[PDB]
Amino acid sequence: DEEQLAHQYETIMDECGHGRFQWILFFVLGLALMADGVEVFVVSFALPSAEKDMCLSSSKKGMLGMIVYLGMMAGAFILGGLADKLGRKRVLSMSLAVNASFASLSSFVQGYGAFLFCRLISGIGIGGALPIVFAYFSEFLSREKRGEHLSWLGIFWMTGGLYASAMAWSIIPHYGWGFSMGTNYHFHSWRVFVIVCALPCTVSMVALKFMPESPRFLLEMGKHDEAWMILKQVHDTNMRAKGTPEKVFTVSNIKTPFKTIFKQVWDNALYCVMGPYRMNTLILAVVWFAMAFSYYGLTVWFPDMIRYFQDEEYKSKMKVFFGEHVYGATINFTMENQIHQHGKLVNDKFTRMYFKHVLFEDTFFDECYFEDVTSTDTYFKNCTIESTIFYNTDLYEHKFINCRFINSTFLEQKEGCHMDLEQDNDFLIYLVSFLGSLSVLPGNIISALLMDRIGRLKMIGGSMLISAVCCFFLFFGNSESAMIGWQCLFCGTSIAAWNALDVITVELYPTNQRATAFGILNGLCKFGAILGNTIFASFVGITKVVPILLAAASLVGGGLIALRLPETREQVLM
Numbered sequence: 001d002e003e004q005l006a007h008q009y010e011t012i013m014d015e016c017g018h019g020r021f022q023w024i025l026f027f028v029l030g031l032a033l034m035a036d037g038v039e040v041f042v043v044s045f046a047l048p049s050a051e052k053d054m055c056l057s058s059s060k061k062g063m064l065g066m067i068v069y070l071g072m073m074a075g076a077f078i079l080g081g082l083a084d085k086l087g088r089k090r091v092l093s094m095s096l097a098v099n100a101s102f103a104s105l106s107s108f109v110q111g112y113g114a115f116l117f118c119r120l121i122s123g124i125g126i127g128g129a130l131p132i133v134f135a136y137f138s139e140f141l142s143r144e145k146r147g148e149h150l151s152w153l154g155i156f157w158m159t160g161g162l163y164a165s166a167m168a169w170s171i172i173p174h175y176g177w178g179f180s181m182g183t184n185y186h187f188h189s190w191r192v193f194v195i196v197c198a199l200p201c202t203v204s205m206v207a208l209k210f211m212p213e214s215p216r217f218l219l220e221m222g223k224h225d226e227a228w229m230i231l232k233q234v235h236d237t238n239m240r241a242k243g244t245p246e247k248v249f250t251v252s253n254i255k256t257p258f259k260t261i262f263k264q265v266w267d268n269a270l271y272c273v274m275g276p277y278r279m280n281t282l283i284l285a286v287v288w289f290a291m292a293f294s295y296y297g298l299t300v301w302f303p304d305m306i307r308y309f310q311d312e313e314y315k316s317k318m319k320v321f322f323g324e325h326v327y328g329a330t331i332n333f334t335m336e337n338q339i340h341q342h343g344k345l346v347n348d349k350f351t352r353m354y355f356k357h358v359l360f361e362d363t364f365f366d367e368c369y370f371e372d373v374t375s376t377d378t379y380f381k382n383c384t385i386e387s388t389i390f391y392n393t394d395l396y397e398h399k400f401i402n403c404r405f406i407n408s409t410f411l412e413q414k415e416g417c418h419m420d421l422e423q424d425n426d427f428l429i430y431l432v433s434f435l436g437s438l439s440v441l442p443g444n445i446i447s448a449l450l451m452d453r454i455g456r457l458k459m460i461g462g463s464m465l466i467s468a469v470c471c472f473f474l475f476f477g478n479s480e481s482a483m484i485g486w487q488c489l490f491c492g493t494s495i496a497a498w499n500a501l502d503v504i505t506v507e508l509y510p511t512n513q514r515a516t517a518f519g520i521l522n523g524l525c526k527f528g529a530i531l532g533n534t535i536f537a538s539f540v541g542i543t544k545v546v547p548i549l550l551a552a553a554s555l556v557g558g559g560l561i562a563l564r565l566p567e568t569r570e571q572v573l574m
């Protein structure tokens with residue numbers, strides 16, 4: 001029966017073992033996670049393209065990928081469940097192709113709506129791709145080390161995070177390119193960035209063609225000749241490199257059992273949430289939602305908090321110039337953080353000036369000349385402009401809030417605010433994301449090195465405990481750099497939890513409801529990511545415990561309720 005089939009397959013993979021083929025597959029399928037990390041970045045951190053490039057302090061957006069996450073929630077449901085009926089390589093290839101097409105295609109649109117509609121489908125693809133990776137590499141390993149050799153794969157998610165962060169603060173260090181983007185090469189670097197991205201997926205898609213399909217899938221459908229060749233192929237591949245190329249595959253025999261393919265996928269996914277696998281899934285869903293919500297919320301809450309603290313340190317410097325009587329001033333030095341409520345400007349000359357955070361609430365502008373005057377967040381509210389000659393200044397006929405002119409004549413247009421030393425905030429959030437992924441190296445290393453030396457049920461509990469402790473420690477370190485250290489710690493501590501959970505999820509599910517489950521759970525993780533990136537980011541200037549307590553409580557409830565899951569070490573793959 002199926003038990004004997006699984007026993008025979010485990011003996012087979014123990015005969016073959018590891019070598020020149022498992023490493024190749026780990027490097028290939030890794031590139032399909034690399035692209036998932038790149039997309040997670042493009043969706044959570046490279047979203048601010050709506051931030052007004054002409055204004056600073058502008059708040060981030062919630063559309064670039066808040067809707068692309070819903071894309072990864074529909075691709076995990078369909079493409080992740082369509083694998084157990086069509087294959088784990090066929091649908092993985094389709095997913096990666098959708099992503100690489102509608103990603104490299106988004107580098108040509110002339111607007112944000114088309115860019116959004118393209119990144120949506122790219123996310124669909126990659127989110128359908130992720131689960132199939134773990135349900136496809138989990139069929140070439142051996143029960144002895146299914147946890148270690150399956151946890152290293154997370155090294156590629158981190159790798160895509162680094163790739164995207166670096167190629168972003170190196171290509172798109174600015175914001176405000178989602179403003180009816182044109183088709184040219186003027187400040188059009190997001191195109192070169194989107195092209196640099198999709199390279200991991202574009203390399204996996206072509207490297208996937210050279211890879212065989214999962215035998216167990218070809219062994220459950222009811223055919224052998226299409227599988228016994230793969231097994232022979234893997235044995236030869238791992239023996240040629242090793243010192244025994246003369247060993248021949250000993251096993252010879254083995255035992256085995258439109259508008260309709262989606263009905264089968266539904267009847268399959270429904271068997272995962274009701275009947276058998278209802279208790280193991282109703283808990284894995286909880287743990288997954290908790291993990292993902294917490295992680296995404298907290299990794300979006302850190303850099304935003306860095307920027308909030310930077311602003312607050314910049315805000316205290318606001319030097320209210322309620323004074324007046326400025327006479328004969330050839331002013332040419334930058335004028336930052338000033339609000340002249342009641343000022344009397346007479347015969348003044350702001351020449352070669354840069355206005356940043358300069359407000360005027362009630363000014364009798366008797367006379368003043370303006371030249372090469374640039375503005376970022378300037379505003380003249382209830383002013384009184386008597387005789388001012390604005391020449392070669394910024395185009396800011398809108399900053400004049402409710403006040404008219406008498407002797408004015410404007411001869412300026414087509415100027416940019418700074419396009420420098422202000423978007424360093426986006427450079428900073430990209431660098432924070434980089435340093436946060438770069439800290440997952442020790443976490444994933446120790447995870448893969450210990451996931452087999454000890455259980456997978458206690459690693460989850462320990463990692464979630466330490467993440468909750470880090471969270472509760474964040475309530476004290478309200479600094480601008482300590483937040484980065486706490487991010488590094490929380491990340492390097494959380495990675496192990498996701499590894500253990502991927503292991504426990506490749507177990508607990510037969511080979512027919514493995515990718516389906518994985519896909520539903522990835523969709524739940526993406527919904528939790530939506531909730532996190534929409535909740536935590538909405539508490540950067542309102543509260544500091546609400547999101548922290550949410551994340552800590554979610555992690556504790558996902559780590560202590562996960563202990564209700566069994567130990568899956570000696571259990572066969574099935």
Ligand SMILES: COCC(CCO[C@H]1CC[C@@]2(C)C(=CC[C@H]3[C@@H]4C[C@@H]5O[C@]6(CC[C@@H](C)CO6)[C@@H](C)[C@@H]5[C@@]4(C)CC[C@@H]32)C1)COC
Nearest residue numbers: 034159160162163164165166167168169170171172173174
């Ligand atoms: C101040 O602004 C500077 C900027 C120009 C700087 O450009 C450089 C920035 C570093 C960057 C992006 C560059 C090329 C190779 C990139 C590396 C390739 C490696 O690939 C990786 C990931 C994939 C792995 C397989 C191998 O290692 C990374 C570790 C390594 C990498 C991604 C780190 C970042 C590197 C270009 C101009 O800004 C407007």
Ligand SMILES: COCC(CCO[C@H]1CC[C@@]2(C)C(=CC[C@H]3[C@@H]4C[C@@H]5O[C@]6(CC[C@@H](C)CO6)[C@@H](C)[C@@H]5[C@@]4(C)CC[C@@H]32)C1)COC
Nearest residue numbers: 018144145148149152155441442445446448449450452453
């Ligand atoms: C195979 O049989 C052994 C197995 C247990 C596995 O133990 C491993 C731990 C030590 C060691 C030497 C082994 C392989 C990968 C090695 C890692 C590769 C990564 O490369 C680096 C280099 C720097 C970065 C560029 C990437 O990461 C290091 C951080 C990481 C590394 C060098 C740390 C040391 C690891 C074996 C169970 O069998 C009894």
Ligand SMILES: CC(C)CCC[C@@H](C)[C@H]1CC[C@H]2[C@@H]3CC=C4C[C@@H](OC(=O)CCC(=O)O)CC[C@]4(C)[C@H]3CC[C@]12C
Nearest residue numbers: 439440442443446458459461462463466488489492493
């Ligand atoms: C629940 C009990 C009975 C079992 C203990 C399980 C351990 C295997 C867990 C618990 C704490 C976990 C550690 C929590 C913190 C880290 C730090 C982490 O390092 C980092 O990447 C962040 C450090 C930094 O850059 O600041 C590496 C993984 C590690 C050792 C974790 C490895 C797995 C550990 C030891």
Ligand SMILES: COCc1nn2c(CN3C[C@@H](CC(F)(F)Cl)CC3=O)c(C(F)(F)F)nc2s1
Nearest residue numbers: 153154157292440491494495498499502522525
């Ligand atoms: C969300 O979708 C469902 C899955 N995501 N996911 C990932 C990707 N991770 C792991 C975490 C990276 C951290 F270090 F910050 Cl904790 C957050 C994240 O996005 C992996 C991994 F390969 F990393 F092990 N396994 C699965 S299942």
Ligand SMILES: CCC(=O)OC[C@H](COP(=O)(O)OCC[N+](C)(C)C)OC(=O)CC
Nearest residue numbers: 167170171184185186187188189190192196
């Ligand atoms: C991949 C190495 C790489 O990342 O190269 C970095 C450069 C920097 O971006 P850029 O300034 O060329 O962006 C285009 C700006 N524009 C359109 C106004 C000229 O990006 C590249 O040129 C990579 C080809």
Ligand SMILES: *[C@@H]1O[C@H](CO)[C@@H](O)[C@H](O)[C@H]1NC(C)=O
Nearest residue numbers: 329330331332333334351352
């Ligand atoms: C500003 O003007 C003063 C004289 O009014 C001059 O000494 C100084 O060099 C000028 N600085 C700049 C940056 O133009």
Ligand SMILES: *[C@@H]1O[C@H](CO)[C@@H](O)[C@H](O)[C@H]1NC(C)=O
Nearest residue numbers: 361362363381382383402403
């Ligand atoms: C501007 O402020 C002054 C000071 O209170 C007030 O007298 C005047 O009516 C205000 N004008 C407008 C247009 O608000």
Ligand SMILES: *[C@@H]1O[C@H](CO)[C@@H](O)[C@H](O)[C@H]1NC(C)=O
Nearest residue numbers: 386387388389406407408409
């Ligand atoms: C300002 O406008 C008034 C009204 O037209 C005019 O009499 C006066 O000459 C103008 N002065 C300047 C400096 O433009």
